[PDB]
């Protein structure tokens, strides 16, 4: 009966992490406290269960600029009393497009979460994910 879902909006941040921030603003979703966005880093669930989890991530970069290796993004899960762990991951190869060329990334997948479970999107260089409206989002809905 109680729908549990959450769509949160990307939020840039001076902090130092490869873990992306999110804000409960704009046209977002947060059906209730049965799902809660804490620390602006992850989404935590209070009810065990199956959930469809996703994160849309577009970023803007350059071939040689950071060049290095690709730009991988990963949907991570951190269950209580368990070490972290990776659920999904997408990865593209920096375009040349100067100054930077955007590129998008998308990852879903159904999972079973233990009560207290909590997920977070993490990328290789947040200093370059794109935050224009509608670009980078993250969220989950329970079946």
């Amino acid at each position, epitope marked *: 009966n109680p729908q549990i879902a959450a769509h949160v909006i990307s*939020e*840039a*941040s*001076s902090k130092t992490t490869s873990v992306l*921030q999110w*804000a*409960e*603003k*704009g*046209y*977002y979703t*947060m059906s209730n406290n049965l799902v*809660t*966005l804490e620390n602006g880093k992850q989404l935590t669930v209070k009810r065990q269960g199956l959930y469809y989890i996703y994160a849309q991530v577009t970023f*803007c*970069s*350059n071939r040689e600029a950071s060049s290095q290796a690709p730009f991988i993004a990963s949907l991570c899960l951190k269950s209580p009393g368990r070490f972290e762990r990776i659920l999904l991951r997408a990865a593209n190869t920096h375009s040349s497009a*100067k*100054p*930077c060329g*955007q590129q998008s990334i998308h990852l879903g997948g159904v999972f079973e979460l233990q009560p207290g479970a909590s997920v977070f999107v993490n990328v290789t260089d947040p*200093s*370059q994910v*794109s*935050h*224009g*409206t509608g670009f980078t989002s993250f969220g989950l809905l329970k079946l």
Partner: antibody
Amino acid sequence: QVQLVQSGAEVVKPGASVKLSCKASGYIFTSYYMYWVKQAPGQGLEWIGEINPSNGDTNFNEKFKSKATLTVDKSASTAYMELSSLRSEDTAVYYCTRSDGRNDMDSWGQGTLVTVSS
Amino acid sequence: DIVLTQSPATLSVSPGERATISCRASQRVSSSTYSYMHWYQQKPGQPPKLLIKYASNLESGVPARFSGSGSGTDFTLTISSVEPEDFATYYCQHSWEIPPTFGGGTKLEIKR
């Protein structure tokens, strides 16, 4: 001290184009989105756009998508605004300011008076 | 675009008088943990100076008289007891979405 030093005032004839610059300092340049705000005589504060300097990536207020062109010189820790095809109502003071997590805009350049007249 | 309406447009207070301006969102801009509202004071000739961010936290350096509250669509900013320097004009501004947009402004005039 964290400071942003905007360029000198500009007087320009309609239809021309001007390229405003803003030199940040006192902090890590690439770690802040640099915004731009226009304030016209009597007219209020208007947000033009945003530029991540690390990136080159930008985002404009639709209402100005045509007038502005945000760009930055990561190396020189500087951002630049290029207003083009200036009508007369384009006259005002253009402020470059450091957004703090793209929310509160916490530091501003002196401002640049762009006055466009024949 | 969200539209913020401040009020009064002019608030005439004397030094030693407490003053509180109010802002207004055409829509809620405060969610479950934060209210994306900020206030600036701006003097003639100068650019705005950030005083309060996220509806109620003093920016670094702002003096304690300055304070702010509110949520959803209404917010206030209030100096506990006006001081000469305080006379200026104030803008409230959100950050709920693109484009951020500023309120009309309120001048904090000197009663006399």
